[PDB]
Structures are given as structure tokens and as C-alpha cells.
Amino acid sequence: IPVPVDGMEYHWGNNDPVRLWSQLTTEGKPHGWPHQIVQYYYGLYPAATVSAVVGMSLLALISIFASCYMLVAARSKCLTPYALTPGAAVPWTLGILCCAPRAHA
Amino acid sequence: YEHSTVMPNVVGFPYKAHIERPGYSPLTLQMQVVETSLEPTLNLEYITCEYKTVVPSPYVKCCGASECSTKEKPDYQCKVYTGVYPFMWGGAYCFCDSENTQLSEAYVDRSDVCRHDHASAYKAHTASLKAKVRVMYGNVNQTVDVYVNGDHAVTIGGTQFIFGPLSSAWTPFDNKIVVYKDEVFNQDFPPYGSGQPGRFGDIQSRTVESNDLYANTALKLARPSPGMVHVPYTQTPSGFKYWLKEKGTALNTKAPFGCQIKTNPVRAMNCAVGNIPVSMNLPDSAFTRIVEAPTIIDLTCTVATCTHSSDFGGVLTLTYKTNKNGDCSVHSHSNVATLQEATAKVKTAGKVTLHFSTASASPSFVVSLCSARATCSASCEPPKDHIVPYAASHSNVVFPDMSGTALSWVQKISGGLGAFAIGAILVLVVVTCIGLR
Amino acid sequence: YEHSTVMPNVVGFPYKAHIERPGYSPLTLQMQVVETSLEPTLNLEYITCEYKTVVPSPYVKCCGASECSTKEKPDYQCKVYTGVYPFMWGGAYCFCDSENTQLSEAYVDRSDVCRHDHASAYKAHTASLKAKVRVMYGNVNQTVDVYVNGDHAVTIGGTQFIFGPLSSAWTPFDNKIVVYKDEVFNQDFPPYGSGQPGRFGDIQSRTVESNDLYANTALKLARPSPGMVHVPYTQTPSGFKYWLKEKGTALNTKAPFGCQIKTNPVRAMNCAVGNIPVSMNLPDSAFTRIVEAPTIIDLTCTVATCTHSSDFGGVLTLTYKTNKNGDCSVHSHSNVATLQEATAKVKTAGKVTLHFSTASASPSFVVSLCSARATCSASCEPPKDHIVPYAASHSNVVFPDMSGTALSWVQKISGGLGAFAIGAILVLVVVTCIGLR
């Protein structure tokens, strides 16, 4: 028989009905390492847990991608003026503070 | 002093209302339901009981010609034949050789005994709550019957309670029900005067004592076989009996929300649905003067151990600093926890222990000892039984609270990414900046 | 034969259904409502009647110490005094000068007689229609009581009628009502067990015979004056009586739609609201074969005079040419006019007179004589009374029809303006064409 958190009631024979209830007893580990805390929540609303974790992961990846995309754009804007006619970068004295030192120099 | 609160309509849930009257010591007023009858109004559409086929002895006016004397009994069927030769034991039944008629007649009627067997066919439309509540504030420990419709104002030693209308109007009974002996089926019975043979309502009495008996049952006679005096007939078996065999699953075994069903005053009891608003008026005699209640200072939580089990699986001890000894209220303003004790005994030593149940790994609820406050926290653990025989004693709130280990980690990760994004924004702004001016 | 139609739920309105079954002569069936009881279901919240203050004779146990012996009677008040010197006639009540106590006690109870003078406080939620309807088709001239819900199936000499649910569900009775003797006030009575001294229901009983008697009445005792044996008390006077003086306008004098109110089986009668859908089944015998039904040719209208009064203020003569004599149905397809007669006699001479009431200055309607048609018209006149003692006998339709004098003028000016505009556009497009090519 399934016994969801709400509980169930079985009526075997003429015996009076008996009611049971299931506690929140997921496997995994309580407060602790994240790879063990998602497991503890996976078991309580498995569909909700997996939906949340992917949402968090995707948003984090988007933010990381945006930051990297932002950093490269800054390098493009900063390095284009220096290298149009001349090869000059103030060899890492002003090549660091303003933008990416990654010019060949 | 008016005070309006809402309790969960769950039998055996120790709700604890906390009234804060300024100029008086706060009073915790714990109350809980014990049974909630949900009786709907009925209209007896008709009564169905196993029929009985009355077959009066044939009237063989042989050596002549009998005529079909029609009647008006329920599903009355009169048939007249010709050229029949009864053989009532000991020889022929009359001196003729032919030209004889048998006046067979048969009709339906309610069973000899169905004041003890009838199966009602009520039509319930409107519900009407009725609940028994036990409330113990200070020292009254009393239980009262009340109509939960917002119109019954029960008085319990002073204080006046009015249990407003139930939040939800859900009713397990459909528009049409059927009550046989101890079960209330959600059938869809045919309307009076439109039953069909074999199924429910073949014989429909408008009332147990009334006599109308629309008993459509397809009673049909047949020509008696030669040489005997029987009265053959072919009738569809008791439609009521067929319903008894094929009734299906009664509502007593599929009612939502664990609603137990009682028949005689047809009703659903212990329906754990919705919230019961409660408005209470109290006399100032019930309260306690602040100048008399002990004062509490420097209140702080410390949870020795929290296991968010169904019962009170969390213990927290409050250290304080009082001026005298006595008793006064304790209550958790937040709902993520539910205290077991209501009034704790305050002593000179700054240590009082309390028990609380919860359902969140990292609950955060500001307890209120006597008159002060202290934000509270705990790193709760999950139990390992998978099964318990008692109902949950905690409002099913599982979402954690910020500063919890689970939320702290996402806070840590989110902040780091935000700072990284902010740094990139600042770098880009400076880059575009130095390009403009 | 199934036919569905709707009648205006107005008492005394001679509605005339005109059924046209193929292969049979058109049949007009005139029918009208005579009274429409609207019984709302009730639940007796509680019964209020003027209270009666019982004051048992004071018990003076002088040079003793009587104690306040509490009880549980309605609003029971027990007060014990000291240092009193009763002065019964003929000298002091006892030897001892002081240290004497009077055990005064008083309590409220239902009046000795309020099985005859109570004021019910029902709570009505659901309505239930019930109407007496007169039907005249062919020759039945019959009246029948029916329940207007679409389930009760009355039969009037063959034809079987079922009146459907009312078009609307408006009910004049608010959620809470109070019934005193012959009036049904739309009060908002206080919840049971919470009446206040002086207003309605200061004394509330669950049922006329039951004995609970929640009697909040502010009954307060006072110290007897020296040298006497009164038992003074200052009770707020009868709350029920003050309700009688401040009852306000009853519902009998402000019910919308002229809803007459009756009390004992509380109900609103003759509520002229909405429409009544009716479904009817007719046996073929009720109809007439076309071949034997006289035919009509060359049908025409000739309105001798029409005054759109409340009663039948219009006479129209139909000129026809038939094959034989007899009688058959006559009807006006449009509702702008209503005919008095339903079936008219057809003679060899082509002249039949009818009376029609109308509410439009220039009405028009397709009169259906027996089987033919005739587009009818009239230049009606207005009457001069300003007042009549009989209801309206015509659906209040005033919007005239095309070809009327009022709109004929509108069309004349509209046509002239249209021609002028059409002339202007034609020249403009001509100028545009010659300017382009």
C-alpha cells in the first residue's frame, strides 16, 4: 500500500479501521555538502527538487557566460584603439589596469 | 477585547492562539477540534425496496367465456385466453371439452417487509458544519458543541467564541446520493416515475408509508401449457437486488480527506479541509496585569536537538533573567514551529525547557516567553521510520529560512557570481568610459 | 409532440402559445398564471420573546452569615449583603441589631406566555417556486398547481406539461429574515448566544419549547435601603419590546415587484419577475387535420380604430374567403399586439372581428387566421386617463415599426439626404475620373 504524507486508512476484515502516516525520511544527508543536500531534498518532492536545481544551474551558467562575454567585449574595445596603426601596449604597466594584458607585446 | 484568528480544521491539531493585549500580560489560548460533523440537507426523492409479485389464483370461468377485467394496480397485467383444458387433480375441471377461458392476472407491490430494508434516494444540496471544540486558556479545560457557520456564539466561562464560516465549501456529497443501511453512495438515480427494469429504481415508493408504487418491471404473462393450472409469467428480477450486488464502491471507502461517513443522520465527520476563522471576545478579568506578571529580560534561544518528526521532535531551552517566580505564556509567532507547552513556569534560575515540532530542516521562529522575544533557529535532522501511527503535529511548512545551511550555500554561490558580474560591469563601464571622454 | 416556449411570469397576463405542427391546422393554446407562491427554505436560528425577571423572596439570616450560593440559571445574579436591619411590619425582623445578611438573588426566564407572542428568527437561503396555472386549449378550461423547476410533470386532459426552471433566481428575502406575527423583516439578527441588552434578541431560546435561554440582560442587583426588605435591581428593559417599537418598515411594504408576503408558510406571492419556460407534449388528438380544417384565402386587415390603452383598446376586422364554416385558431405572431380571442368562428361571409391591445403608436403584426397570414398595420391613438385600476394587458413594447407615421417622416428626410449625398459623390467621382484620364 502507498502511504503518502497525508496518510492512509486500511480496514482489514471486521477490525476497526487503522490509520497510518509517513514521515519526511528521505535518504541523503542533512545540512552539509551541497552534493549531499540536494539528495536530502530529492525524496521530498522529487519533481520540485530537480526543477529547482536545473533552474539554479542554468541561471548560474548564464551569469558566468555573461561575465565572460562581458570581459571579452571589454578587451575588444580596449585593445582595438592601441593596435590600429601602432604596436604598443605600455608593456603591462598600463596593459593590466585598463584591460586584458593578453596582448602579445 | 475582540481578537480574530484562524485555526486549521484538522482534528487533534493543538492550535495555540496568542492574544497580546497592551497593558496586560499576553495570554496563550490553546484550542483544538475533536470532531466536525458535516450534515447536509436532504430531500427524500423516493424509496426503493425489493418488489413482490402478487399473482391471484386464476379465475377459470370454463364452460363459458370470461372477460378481461382491467384494474389499476402497479404494473397490473390481466390476460384472458381461450380453448384451455384445466386438469385440476382428479379429472377434468368441467364438463366442456373446449370453449374455456383462464383470467390470469398479476401485479407488482412493495415487499411484505421493506420498512426494514428500503434504500433511500435522497438529494442533498446544502451543507451545514457542526464541530466539537476543546479550549483551555488559563484553567477552564472545557469542551463545547458549536455550529461552524458564523452564527453560534458559545460562552466558555466569560470569553465568547464565534466560529466563522468555513473557509472552503467543499462537500464530499454530490447533488444526488443514495443511503441504503450504513453507506451513502454517490449514485445518479433515475427521477421518480422513470425507472427501468433490472436496474435501480424499478419499484419506487414516494415514501415508506405512502402508497404510489410506480413499479415498471415488464411483467408479462404467457399462455398456460395444456393440462395444468399454473399462471406463467416472466418478470425481470428485483432491480433493487441487482443494485445490491453491483452497488460498487461505497462513499465510505473513497471519501476525500479521510471523511468518515455515518448514515442515520447522514453526515461526514472529521473532514480535514480548510481553515476555521475564530473571533473571540474576552473579559478583562481573564487577562493578567503587567504589574503582576513576572518580567523577562535577555531572552535567547538554544536548540539542544531538532528532528523534524511528526510529533514534538524538537527541544529548545530559553535562558532569561526574571525578577520573580510564576507562570506565563509561551508561543511561536511564526508557523514553521508549533510548541507543545502553552504556559511555562518561570523560575529565578534563567532556564526553561520547551518542546516544539516542525517540518523544516532549518526553521526560524521567534518564540515569545511571557512578554519578551528572541529570534530562534535550529539545524534540524530528518527522522528514520518512514511510518508513524499518529497524525502530524506540525503545519506542513517545509521551505527553509535564509541563514540556513541550504540557503547559506546558495547565498554564498549567488554572492560570488554577483560580485564577478559586478566586477565585469565595472570593468566594462570603465572601458567604455575611457573611450568616450 | 414536443413544443418549448416561454411565458412572462406576470399574473393575469393572457399569454397565447401558437403551436404549428406540420400536417395539422395551427393550434392556439391560451394560458396564464394566477398565483406564484415562492417558498424559501428556512432554518430556525432561535426564538426571541419578552423576558420575565423572577426575583425569589430575599432570605434574611440575621445575626448569622449567609453565603452567596451560586447557581446556573439564565443570567443568574446572587448578591449577599451585610449590616442590614430588615424592618418587617410590627417591629424589627429579629432581635439582633447588626451582623445580619440578606441573600438577594434574581434571574431571567422566558415570559410565562410566549408560545403565543414569540418572534422567529429564521435563516432562509434557497427559494422554491410554486405556481397555479390556467390552461385553455380546445375545451378544457382547467387550472393546475405546479412546481416551477422542470421536474414536476402535470397532465391536463391529454397534453402533459412540464414548467422549466425560472428564467431568474432573484428572491426578495435576504439571507437572514425575522418573522414576528404576519411580517417578514429583513433584519440582521445577532448570532445566537451574543445578544446585547436592549436590542433585538437580548433573550434568545433555541426553540420555543427547548430550554437554554441565553439571557444576557445586564441584570444588576443593589443594596437594599435601610429599614426595608426590597430586592432592588436595575435591569435594562425588554429587548424584544424595544424591537417592536423600533422594528422599522417590514418587508411587506417594500418587497420589489409587488411581491405580496404571507407569513405562516412564509412565502412571497405574485412576484412578477422573469419568465417561465414551459415544455409541453401533445397527443395527435388535440390537433386538427388540415383537410377538414377550413382554409382561408385573400386575408386582409382593416383596423377600425386602435387606442393603445392598458386594456384591449384596439379592434381589427379581417376580410377573408373560406371554403366552409367552422372554428379554428387565430394568433398574432408579433408581440407588439396581444389578441383577446384565441379561436374565432369562420363563416361563409368573410368577416371576423377581433380585439387587440397594444402599446405602440403605430403597431404592425402578422395575424395568423386559421392557417393564412396577413401583415397588419394601424395608426393607433393614445388614451387620456393617466390612471387605471387594472394591470397592463400588453407587453410594454413601444418601438414603432417601419412604415409608421413617425418613421415614415424619418425615412422621407433620410431618403432626401441620401439622394443629395449620392448626387454629391457621383459628381465628385466624375470630376476625379475626368481629372485622371
Short mmCIF file of C-alpha atoms in Angstrom, two decimals, chain A residues 22-32 36-45, chain B residues 305-311 313-314 358-363 378-388 394 398:
data_model
loop_
_atom_site.label_atom_id
_atom_site.label_comp_id
_atom_site.label_asym_id
_atom_site.label_seq_id
_atom_site.Cartn_x
_atom_site.Cartn_y
_atom_site.Cartn_z
CA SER A 22 4.53 8.68 6.58
CA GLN A 23 7.22 11.00 7.93
CA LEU A 24 9.71 13.05 5.92
CA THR A 25 12.50 10.46 5.93
CA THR A 26 14.46 11.00 2.73
CA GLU A 27 17.84 9.38 2.19
CA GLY A 28 20.91 11.52 1.68
CA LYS A 29 22.50 13.83 4.19
CA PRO A 30 21.06 16.81 6.11
CA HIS A 31 22.82 20.18 6.38
CA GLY A 32 26.22 19.66 4.80
CA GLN A 36 24.59 15.63 -0.28
CA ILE A 37 21.96 18.29 0.49
CA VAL A 38 20.19 18.04 -2.87
CA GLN A 39 19.94 14.32 -2.16
CA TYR A 40 18.19 15.04 1.14
CA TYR A 41 15.69 17.24 -0.70
CA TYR A 42 15.48 14.71 -3.55
CA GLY A 43 12.93 12.46 -1.89
CA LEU A 44 10.85 15.38 -0.67
CA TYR A 45 9.05 16.47 -3.82
CA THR B 305 18.39 18.95 19.18
CA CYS B 306 15.80 19.22 16.41
CA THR B 307 14.45 16.26 14.44
CA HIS B 308 11.53 17.39 12.29
CA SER B 309 9.39 14.36 13.11
CA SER B 310 5.60 14.23 13.12
CA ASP B 311 5.49 14.62 16.91
CA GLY B 313 10.80 16.20 17.88
CA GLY B 314 12.50 19.49 18.68
CA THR B 358 8.37 21.35 12.85
CA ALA B 359 8.76 20.20 9.27
CA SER B 360 11.65 22.37 8.01
CA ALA B 361 15.31 21.38 8.01
CA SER B 362 16.21 24.93 9.11
CA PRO B 363 13.23 26.52 10.88
CA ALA B 378 17.94 25.22 14.57
CA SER B 379 19.73 22.74 12.32
CA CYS B 380 17.03 20.09 12.25
CA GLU B 381 17.56 16.49 11.14
CA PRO B 382 15.18 14.06 9.40
CA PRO B 383 13.85 11.01 11.26
CA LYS B 384 14.20 7.41 10.06
CA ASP B 385 10.97 5.45 10.49
CA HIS B 386 9.11 6.05 7.21
CA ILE B 387 5.84 5.36 9.05
CA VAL B 388 4.04 6.56 12.18
CA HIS B 394 3.13 20.43 12.61
CA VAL B 398 9.00 22.78 4.60
#
